[PDB]
RNA sequence: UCUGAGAGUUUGAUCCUGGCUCAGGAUUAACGCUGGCGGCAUGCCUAAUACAUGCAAGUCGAUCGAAAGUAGUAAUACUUUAGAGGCGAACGGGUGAGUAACACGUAUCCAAUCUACCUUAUAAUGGGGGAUAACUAGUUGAAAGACUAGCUAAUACCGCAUAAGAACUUUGGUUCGAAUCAAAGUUGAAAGGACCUGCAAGGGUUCGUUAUUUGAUGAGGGUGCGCCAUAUCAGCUAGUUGGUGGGGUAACGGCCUACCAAGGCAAUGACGUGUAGCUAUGCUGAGAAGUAGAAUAGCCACAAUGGGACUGAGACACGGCCCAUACUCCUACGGGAGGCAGCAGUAGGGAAUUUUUCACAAUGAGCGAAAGCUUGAUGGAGCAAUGCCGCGUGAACGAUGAAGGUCUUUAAGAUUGUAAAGUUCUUUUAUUUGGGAAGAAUGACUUUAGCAGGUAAUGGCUAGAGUUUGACUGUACCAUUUUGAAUAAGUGACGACUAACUAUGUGCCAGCAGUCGCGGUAAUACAUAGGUCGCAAGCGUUAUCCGGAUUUAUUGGGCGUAAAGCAAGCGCAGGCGGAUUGAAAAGUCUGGUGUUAAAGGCAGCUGCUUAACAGUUGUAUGCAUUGGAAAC
């Protein structure tokens, strides 16, 4: 939201980058990618979100499965 | 005052009626819960006598308890 | 502003002009005593101190200190 | 969760009946095997000191249905008293209302006792209790005024009374009373309370 | 600026709560933000709210939906990438056929019979093709409608690796595309216009003068109906060219038809 | 005895120096998925950024004249005050920009202070004057207002009588800069209002006045200690360091002035710099301590910004004033008006921090004998899983285990799973019916009994009186109060640490990722289905404080090959320091005493559904005085 142009990663399968996508991130280091310590929350204001998972959909924000 | 909502409490204090409450006190005299009226208190009437000798009028409704302490029998009628 | 401040102004402005007059005449008495030393102006200041210190116009300490100083410097005359 | 849901499923992996033995012993057959489609030979490939500590703690709260925050509450309460804290805690472990009602011959299961207590059929010393976690104390009288004739469960428990010295009861008059603190020998001994109190210093 | 993009998206949030009928698209290829409007006054009032009500200052341009690319008659070239960048040797070499396929996308056919390329390298090379067509030497749009036929290759020792073959295949694809005179395809929308009588000749002359594919008449119950397969660029101002001539009493349906060959004039216009 | 649990991690391998990660807590917590509710609070930390609107601190007619209106034939009684006069306003609430220092806290000193309204204590509570307020009429404009001339009241203002008492002056009489008495010199005391009584005279009640002596309160002043880092910041300093006189503050004080000089501080770090409201304390550890100073409580600073003054006991006054600054708003354009770091609410920001909600029911504060008035304080109530505590979504029995599905891999079995079906029962909660609070054991209110100087009598006071006060609240909850399983469970992990794996897809790609690391051709590491396990209306993710980390190791580590010995010597200060005898005990221990508010916890008790929590009771660091101790 301020002037801090820094790296980040897209955690999870696929992506929803729009070259202007406003979304939320995650703080945490990744060992294999030096200089990168950031991610993107899947499903915040731009990202679609992924359902049908007993996995994340707690993280990687996605609505509770509907049946 | 203190306590909880639906659970009032107010420790009776012989405090200056012109200075705010919930602060430093020369001497705390008694306590009472106004929710359920049973008149439980820890009044002293020993240093309170000195306070009344040097004014120190407590809060508005303390005079009723003053009647129970019976100080009127020993404070106002003490010159005759 | 509020009406109460207006009433306080309407009062204390005139009370302050009155007090200014009293203080300036006390000042004039002090001046006349500074010109020459005599018992008549000593009595004048004696009266004025009681006129002004009676109310909040002049503090008791200030009046007592000034009269003590004047009578002390008079004691050598 | 307030309830484990399926209670025989709890005895599946544990291999211990919460009843005497009849929980998973007489329902058609005796299914005391651990669950899991991935089931295979497991004799010494899943048991450790940490694992046995978890097993003891798990069966301990399963016997009473204590939630984590209430578990820490009871831990602090038994900290408030001195002596051998493990055995004192175990004595407090019977201070549950539903556990006592089950042990008083007033409910065939502690689960039934809990659901009666929440329903409001119980009277604890002129005070109906809907929370079944209240702490017992010696010298407490209970009543079952009117919500007991329509309940066959409470009567069936009454005829199948339980003998206990730490409490007194007139099951034919629907009367119960907590008399004294319970004795360790009257209770199962496979549980080790020490390891859990060692495990509870993490605040 | 990208900050201007963000502030214009804030203005979009403000202006979409009143009437969200306007559509906004951020194209992944053309890039410029397309916003829909009714007419001159509608766009004007949107601009007025943007600059005065919202204090948002953004430049205004022209709508962006560009093209597709393909190429001419077939040819066959080879790719030899003997190279290295980082600490050791690298090499790869393949031989593929670059053939157009008018109605089919990427297609692979193998011609390895003498063991020139192991099956392990059959699949990566395909990907090397699938990424190589993405750029064109005229304006850079991806090349589609191509049939690829791998013929030969050479797997060497440890110097050989799969990505080296992919890069060699990419070189071959680009070289053959340069040789085989690439061409462009423009989007074409199918527009149907139904007018009682008034703008028969008007629309006829507009389509004939501007662009479009037409054939005569359709005579509906009491109206004249004309369907034109017209380039999507020709819709620029057509919404008001027809409406102004119709005094606001015009309507049509805009549906995308297909990509069609670009004439030489379009070849001269778009290039820098 | 208060009181202490680690795990993995280099490499052929082993430890070691030593880093890393998390297992644990906490959080104004934020976010995701979801989500009935009880009770306990709390609920801008971003922008002291800018704000509409309302309240936000006003009261007294028995202080005063008179005005307006009702009743009344009038007088007069009554209703309200335009205003004056008295008091509250400086309470209180909110903020943390500023401030790195008497500021907090703490012990004491004010031989150098003050402190209405409230304590003690006495002297009385007059004689007048002359004025204006309000109003009337005119002038200027739509108006706010402003200006001009006439009439007056006040417990208002100002002289005049005496001053009990004080204070000053002088003399005599005191004490280790002191305090007390006597005489004389001088000065200046009040204002009346209401009521009862009294033919009246006058007397009394009550309010108020004046001055006097004494509490308490609050403020000011004195220091010691405690109260960030920065030397890749060594000189600072001329009101500066002191002295004499004067002005001056409630008092001392270069606080300031005139004169006289040139010192003063600073290597034990001033100054400069950035970082800061401080404390009790919240949390983390057994603790030494760290964390931050939530909220609350005490203290200090501020009120759009810089000054300046204003009365008042008390302010340079959130919501008094002028100037100047900056802004905003209105102006029919001449001129004016104002300052939410008050309650909220509103705009921006962020991930985000709520109602312009109700009654002043209680409490409190203010004004007033009195009634009565104000009270965006206060108490509630609204909202939020934000934390805490607590409860349901069924329960009794119930099958070689219903149907389907899963694995096994067609075969059985298990498996989902007492979960299911089935019978029976129930209702806190969902929901109908009646009950249903204390909170007000207060406060008003007059007659009675009594007390009490008076007594002619009201009134001064204590024991009973009801007309008196509820938003909360026909509220929680409760008699199967109506019916009814009906009104309701997700989340993470499952290669190891870390208790949790099968089937399929899959091909170092897709992706997981706290670490070790997995996945390049059947992956118990990824993605799905099923299953397992753990917590649960919370579970997952992030940030940040700590434990773990004793990993800057007095407590509680080393310096040879790892990180560590200046290349060495002279080597000041300082630190450490041979023996014997004495005293003081400065240090030290210890006894007596005071202080260290409450609240925090530790423990007991009480009220809660045990419960968190609230109240009751005590528990303490530390400092000072005094008596000892003699080892060091």
Curated annotation (Swiss-Prot), chain A:
Descriptive protein name: Small ribosomal subunit protein uS12
Residue window of the full protein shown: 71 to 137 of 139
Family, per entry: Belongs to the universal ribosomal protein uS12 family.
Domain of life: Bacteria
Subunit structure, interactors included: Part of the 30S ribosomal subunit. Contacts proteins S8 and S17. May interact with IF1 in the 30S initiation complex.
Function: With S4 and S5 plays an important role in translational accuracy.
Organism name: Mycoplasma pneumoniae (strain ATCC 29342 / M129 / Subtype 1) (Mycoplasmoides pneumoniae)
Curated annotation (Swiss-Prot), chain C:
Keywords: Ribonucleoprotein, Ribosomal protein, RNA-binding, rRNA-binding
Keyword Oxidoreductase applies: no
Pfam families: Ribosomal_S20p (PF01649)
InterPro entries named among the record's database cross-references: Ribosomal_bS20 (IPR002583), Ribosomal_bS20_sf (IPR036510)
Biological processes annotated in GO: translation
Cysteine disulfide links: none
An annotated GO cellular component: ribosome
Source superkingdom: Bacteria
GO molecular function: rRNA binding; structural constituent of ribosome
Gene3D superfamilies with a match to the protein in the record: Ribosomal protein S20
Role this protein plays: Binds directly to 16S ribosomal RNA.
Record family assignment: Belongs to the bacterial ribosomal protein bS20 family.
Protein name in UniProt: Small ribosomal subunit protein bS20
Organism per entry: Mycoplasma pneumoniae (strain ATCC 29342 / M129 / Subtype 1) (Mycoplasmoides pneumoniae)
Curated annotation (Swiss-Prot), chain D:
MF terms in GO: rRNA binding; structural constituent of ribosome
Pfam family, one: Ribosomal_S4
Subunit-structure text: Part of the 30S ribosomal subunit. Contacts protein S5. The interaction surface between S4 and S5 is involved in control of translational fidelity.
Organism: Mycoplasma pneumoniae (strain ATCC 29342 / M129 / Subtype 1)
Gene3D superfamilies listed in its UniProt record: Ribosomal Protein S4 Delta 41, Chain A, domain 1 (1.10.1050.10), RNA-binding S4 domain (3.10.290.10)
Name used for this protein in its record: Small ribosomal subunit protein uS4
GO CC terms, sorted: small ribosomal subunit
Record-annotated S4 RNA-binding domain positions: 95-156
Swiss-Prot record, chain E:
Superkingdom assignment: Bacteria
Cellular localisation: Cytoplasm
Family: Belongs to the TRAFAC class translation factor GTPase superfamily. Classic translation factor GTPase family. EF-G/EF-2 subfamily.
Function description: Catalyzes the GTP-dependent ribosomal translocation step during translation elongation. During this step, the ribosome changes from the pre-translocational (PRE) to the post-translocational (POST) state as the newly formed A-site-bound peptidyl-tRNA and P-site-bound deacylated tRNA move to the P and E sites, respectively. Catalyzes the coordinated movement of the two tRNA molecules, the mRNA and conformational changes in the ribosome.
Protein name: Elongation factor G
Organism: Mycoplasma pneumoniae (strain ATCC 29342 / M129 / Subtype 1)
Source species taxonomy: Bacteria, Bacillati, Mycoplasmatota, Mycoplasmoidales, Mycoplasmoidaceae
Residues represented out of the complete protein: 414 to 685 of 688
